[PDB]
Amino acid sequence: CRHLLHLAIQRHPHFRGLFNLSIPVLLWGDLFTPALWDRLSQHKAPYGWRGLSHQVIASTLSLLNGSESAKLFAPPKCIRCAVVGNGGILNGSRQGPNIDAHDYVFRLNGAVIKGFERDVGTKTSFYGFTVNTMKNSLVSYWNLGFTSVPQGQDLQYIFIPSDIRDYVMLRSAILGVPVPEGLDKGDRPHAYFGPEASASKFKLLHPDFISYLTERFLKSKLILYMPSTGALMLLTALHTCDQVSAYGFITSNYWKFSDHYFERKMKPANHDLSLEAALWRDLHKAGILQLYQR
Ligand SMILES: Nc1ccn([C@@H]2O[C@H](COP(=O)(O)O)[C@@H](O)[C@H]2O)c(=O)n1
Numbered sequence: 097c098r099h100l101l102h103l104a105i106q107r108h109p110h111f112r113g114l115f116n117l118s119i120p121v122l123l124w125g126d127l128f129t130p131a132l133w134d135r136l137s138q139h140k141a142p143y144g145w146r147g148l149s150h151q152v153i154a155s156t157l158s159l160l161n162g163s164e165s166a167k168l169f170a171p172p173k174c175i176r177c178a179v180v181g182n183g184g185i186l187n188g189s190r191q192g193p194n195i196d197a198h199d200y201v202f203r204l205n206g207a208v209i210k211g212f213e214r215d216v217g218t219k220t221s222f223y224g225f226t227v228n229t230m231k232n233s234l235v236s237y238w239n240l241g242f243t244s245v246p247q248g249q250d251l252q253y254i255f256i257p258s259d260i261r262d263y264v265m266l267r268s269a270i271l272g273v274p275v276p277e278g279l280d281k282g283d284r285p286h287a288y289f290g291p292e293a294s295a296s297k298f299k300l301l302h303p304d305f306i307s308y309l310t311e312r313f314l315k316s317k318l319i320l321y322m323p324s325t326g327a328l329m330l331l332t333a334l335h336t337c338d339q340v341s342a343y344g345f346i347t348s349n350y351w352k353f354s355d356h357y358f359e360r361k362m363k364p365a366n367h368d369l370s371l372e373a374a375l376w377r378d379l380h381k382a383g384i385l386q387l388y389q390r
């Protein structure tokens with residue numbers, strides 16, 4: 097059944113030579129080699145770990161030793177995914193039923209659900225975030241409903257390796273101990289992610305996957321530049337799912353809607369939103385991506 101989105105990829109030459117369904121999406125222990133440490137130490141930002149201590153990175157990556165840390169999905173069924181961006185287009189879209197009908201749902205950053213479920217749904221299978229944006233969302237959108245990140249029995253949290261805080265928070269979450277060092281010292285991972293503290297709950301996006309995404313799909317002339325978390329998440333789904341629908345992502349008529357679907361009234365890092373919008377348009381036209389528009 098996978099040959100649904102894969103067929104669309106091959107039928108058009110442009111993306112046929114741009115997709116590489118072999119690069120690892122997730123970083124885990126069996127990939128931590130002194131070779132990888134050499135290269136990735138020459139890149140900062142989420143593209144590597146220059147200036148980050150071996151002790152921290154080695155200690156976190158030692159928890160990702162299990163085979164389950166390597167993949168988002170476990171092993172003949174079809175994988176139908178929905179990626180929920182936070183754009184104002186979903187406001188009054190009443191897309192809840194369509195979003196929740198998918199097998200798996202990706203959400204990210206300010207995934208406000210209370211008060212907006214009829215528009216955006218309640219199902220969550222994956223929650224992507226940097227520690228910085230997650231806590232910034234808990235501060236900015238607390239009154240709007242976001243009093244906690246989405247939780248679920250079989251929900252997995254996807255860490256974007258944008259800063260040493262992400263490794264520290266990832267390491268503390270798997271161990272089930274409060275974060276001992278760094279900017280987030282004192283936080284309780286259980287209060288963010290719930291009672292389960294295992295490697296089956298928390299995953300880490302591969303820095304080489306992010307570099308490959310930037311280089312092949314979103315190499316903006318702004319080149320620190322990096323794609324939006326939504327873009328990262330959407331592209332993560334494009335590489336792991338058999339069909340993905342995108343909701344709440346920036347479109348050409350973005351100006352008709354508030355900044356976010358959950359803002360109080362109409363509201364207006366280094367990203368190229370115009371490039372990302374053009375990517376989702378081309379993916380839509382090539383039939384690779386179902387993009388929600390109106
Ligand atoms: N107007 C908007 C708002 C958000 N988005 C997507 O939703 C993601 C999450 O938004 P926030 O980080 O504001 O919560 C963004 O990273 C972006 O990819 C969008 O594409 N257009």
Ligand SMILES: *[C@@H]1O[C@H](CO)[C@@H](O)[C@H](O)[C@H]1NC(C)=O
Pocket residue numbers: 115116118119120
């Ligand atoms: C896919 O990426 C891997 C690196 O992970 C590389 O070795 C391989 O040649 C690439 N294949 C294609 C078709 O781009």
Ligand SMILES: *[C@@H]1O[C@H](CO)[C@@H](O)[C@H](O)[C@H]1NC(C)=O
Pocket residue numbers: 187188189354356357358359360361362
């Ligand atoms: C659109 O969003 C604004 C704030 O984001 C909200 O006040 C308004 O009720 C929404 N309109 C709808 C859902 O028709």
